[PDB]
Amino acid sequence: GSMDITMFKEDLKSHLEEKIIPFWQSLKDDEFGGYYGYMDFNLNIDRKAQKGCVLNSRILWFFSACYNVLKSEKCKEMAFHAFEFLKNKFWDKEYEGLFWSVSHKGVPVDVTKHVYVQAFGIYGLSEYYEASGDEEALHMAKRLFEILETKCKRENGYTEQFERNWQEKENRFLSENGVIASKTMNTHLHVLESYTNLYRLLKLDDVYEALEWIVRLFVDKIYKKGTGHFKVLCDDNWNELIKAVSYGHDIEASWLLDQAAKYLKDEKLKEEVEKLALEVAQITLKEAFDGQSLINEMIEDRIDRSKIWWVEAETVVGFFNAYQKTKEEIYLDAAIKTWEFIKEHLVDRRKNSEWLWKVNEDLEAVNMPIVEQWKCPYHNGRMCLEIIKRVD
């Protein structure tokens, strides 16, 4: 470590404690349970907004992880609140697994079962089990794992969307021209992430075998060799629908794969993953880091240079991870520069706010919600928590 790294860590911990945690605490829905589902750009909460399961599981994960790292008893209480809503409203008492979305009162809105949702369920529940010791949470996590492996898994990866009763259907994720993507790297990335967390807490051989399997899939099918990029949206055989690169998902994958690699008993696979993770970091830095921040994506030859909150959060973690593995200061420099960028342009300076969704290529704020089914405390919360865990 170093003075810069120490001050960096102190800065993130202060930010987490004084900005992020109090904000998400304010979203607690004491009327019907869970957390309110929407807050607009002008900081107005829609109490009656539909509640997405991914958002609730991400809040569950976040407050659970805050307790596990910071030992905040209030955070544990907030996790409990999210867990109660998960157990009571999102968990399907007939067919098991987690609904996609419910009304603000908990009435099912979309009962279909997506692997993306089940994975975040495992991630959040496993983290909550660590925080609370609640064996009910562990039971549900284990059951979600069982269902993914026995009902959803195929030879090429996971079929991603199902009817409520686990009969397979076509996926809901589309290309920018409206074509259904049967395999998506982001669904499979969150399966890897949740299985890592599960195995960390529950060292079952069954979970180990599944974790190695999905790591192998990333190495053999999803990564595009030597390019530093993963496939994004694919057909059922991992052929790309469109030549597209998601720089945020690349750099996120780099450090999540590196993390999974730590648990691998297969030393050949382990060194392959570690090399892969490093190549992604190197190429992300060269291609996507503009000296200040990371750009978003490139579709064919069309580059989106908007600065998106979660992309910048994952860049900080991924470049810091690259620094730790290489001791090359250029990665550390990039991580800290990205964090100063976030502080200057994405952290909202209004009262009772949090992070902005994005600024455009010229760094002007765009009207987007502060809280939505897809905007959570998970990417930015985890950025802070990761640095805190990594720095002694």
Side-chain angles (χ1 to χ4, degrees), residues 1-360 362-392:
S2 71
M3 177 177 210
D4 290 335
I5 294 172
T6 293
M7 296 191 294
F8 176 48
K9 178 211 168 159
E10 290 183 5
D11 201 26
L12 274 46
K13 185 175 170 293
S14 292
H15 183 71
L16 178 66
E17 292 181 316
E18 298 161 5
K19 180 70 157 195
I20 297 173
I21 288 173
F23 179 77
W24 285 95
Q25 288 173 347
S26 78
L27 272 291
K28 193 177 130 168
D29 183 347
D30 260 316
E31 295 85 58
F32 300 96
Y35 289 78
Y36 301 119
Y38 195 85
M39 175 187 293
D40 65 20
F41 183 71
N42 291 127
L43 302 191
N44 295 309
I45 300 169
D46 178 11
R47 292 188 186 166
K48 271 60 76 173
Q50 292 178 349
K51 294 168 171 166
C53 185
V54 175
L55 175 53
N56 189 74
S57 286
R58 282 176 180 187
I59 296 173
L60 175 61
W61 174 82
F62 171 72
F63 280 126
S64 294
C66 286
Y67 176 77
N68 291 330
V69 172
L70 307 165
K71 262 66 191 195
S72 169
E73 292 289 338
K74 176 139 290 182
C75 283
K76 187 172 176 173
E77 291 190 337
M78 302 281 158
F80 174 76
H81 192 80
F83 171 71
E84 280 295 298
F85 202 73
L86 182 154
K87 175 172 62 67
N88 289 330
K89 304 304 187 290
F90 283 114
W91 183 264
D92 187 345
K93 295 184 179 60
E94 280 307 305
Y95 294 101
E96 301 182 285
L98 298 171
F99 297 135
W100 176 270
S101 68
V102 305
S103 75
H104 73 104
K105 304 195 182 190
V107 172
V109 165
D110 185 338
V111 297
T112 57
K113 306 287 173 57
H114 202 279
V115 170
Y116 192 107
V117 169
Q118 318 309 310
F120 268 101
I122 294 167
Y123 193 49
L125 289 163
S126 60
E127 196 74 25
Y128 183 66
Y129 171 74
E130 176 175 12
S132 71
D134 195 342
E135 294 264 329
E136 177 158 37
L138 178 134
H139 165 83
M140 306 169 75
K142 291 194 304 202
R143 185 69 193 122
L144 294 172
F145 173 79
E146 294 171 21
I147 291 167
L148 285 180
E149 294 305 292
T150 67
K151 299 180 190 172
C152 305
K153 193 180 204 168
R154 308 288 190 263
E155 61 181 340
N156 34 7
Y158 297 86
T159 290
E160 305 197 355
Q161 192 177 223
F162 303 85
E163 304 280 3
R164 187 196 173 186
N165 72 348
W166 298 105
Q167 229 161 350
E168 156 194 336
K169 56 182 291 182
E170 71 270 17
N171 209 355
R172 78 153 67 211
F173 298 146
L174 312 176
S175 71
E176 65 170 17
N177 307 118
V179 174
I180 290 176
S182 294
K183 291 290 178 286
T184 64
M185 97 78 99
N186 82 322
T187 292
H188 284 75
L189 188 61
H190 294 307
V191 171
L192 179 131
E193 172 190 64
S194 71
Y195 285 8
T196 298
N197 213 42
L198 189 56
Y199 183 71
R200 174 177 70 88
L201 302 170
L202 175 84
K203 297 268 158 48
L204 272 38
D205 287 341
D206 272 340
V207 179
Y208 173 77
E209 292 295 317
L211 178 59
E212 185 184 291
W213 191 89
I214 187 65
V215 166
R216 276 195 201 279
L217 182 71
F218 267 88
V219 168
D220 292 335
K221 289 286 186 54
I222 310 182
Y223 186 62
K224 289 127 84 175
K225 294 179 187 63
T227 79
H229 310 309
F230 296 89
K231 299 171 186 172
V232 183
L233 301 180
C234 297
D235 65 14
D236 207 43
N237 292 271
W238 288 106
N239 307 299
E240 288 175 294
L241 296 181
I242 309 181
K243 194 176 181 301
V245 174
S246 176
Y247 296 111
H249 286 116
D250 287 337
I251 195 55
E252 183 179 7
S254 160
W255 76 263
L256 289 175
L257 282 166
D258 215 12
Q259 174 179 80
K262 303 304 163 275
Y263 300 100
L264 296 185
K265 293 138 68 177
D266 191 321
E267 204 69 21
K268 175 70 177 285
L269 181 60
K270 184 194 280 288
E271 198 32 70
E272 233 176 341
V273 169
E274 289 180 338
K275 179 166 105 51
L276 187 158
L278 206 65
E279 188 172 72
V280 174
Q282 193 179 41
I283 289 178
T284 301
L285 175 68
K286 222 312 107 202
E287 303 189 350
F289 181 70
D290 66 14
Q292 195 185 27
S293 63
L294 211 82
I295 56 179
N296 178 29
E297 66 180 4
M298 181 173 58
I299 312 281
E300 301 184 296
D301 65 334
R302 295 177 300 279
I303 312 177
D304 177 10
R305 303 195 199 93
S306 299
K307 281 79 187 171
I308 300 181
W309 94 96
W310 71 265
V311 174
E312 309 309 337
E314 294 306 337
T315 295
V316 170
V317 181
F319 284 164
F320 189 82
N321 181 65
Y323 166 71
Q324 292 191 288
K325 297 306 186 298
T326 70
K327 300 307 175 188
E328 292 175 30
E329 184 180 59
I330 189 176
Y331 292 113
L332 179 59
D333 189 78
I336 293 182
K337 280 184 178 175
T338 304
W339 165 241
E340 328 190 1
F341 176 83
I342 290 163
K343 287 198 306 181
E344 187 181 349
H345 293 105
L346 288 170
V347 178
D348 199 341
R349 292 311 169 178
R350 298 171 296 179
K351 284 57 182 197
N352 322 330
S353 200
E354 193 237 27
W355 289 27
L356 302 173
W357 186 301
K358 68 185 277 201
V359 290
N360 61 18
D362 291 331
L363 306 188
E364 334 178 71
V366 196
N367 186 313
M368 292 292 283
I370 307 303
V371 177
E372 202 250 349
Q373 68 179 331
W374 296 117
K375 183 159 182 306
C376 58
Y378 150 80
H379 289 283
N380 59 335
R382 186 173 61 181
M383 176 199 66
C384 297
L385 292 159
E386 276 299 311
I387 299 312
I388 288 162
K389 290 189 299 170
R390 288 166 185 260
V391 173
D392 191 330

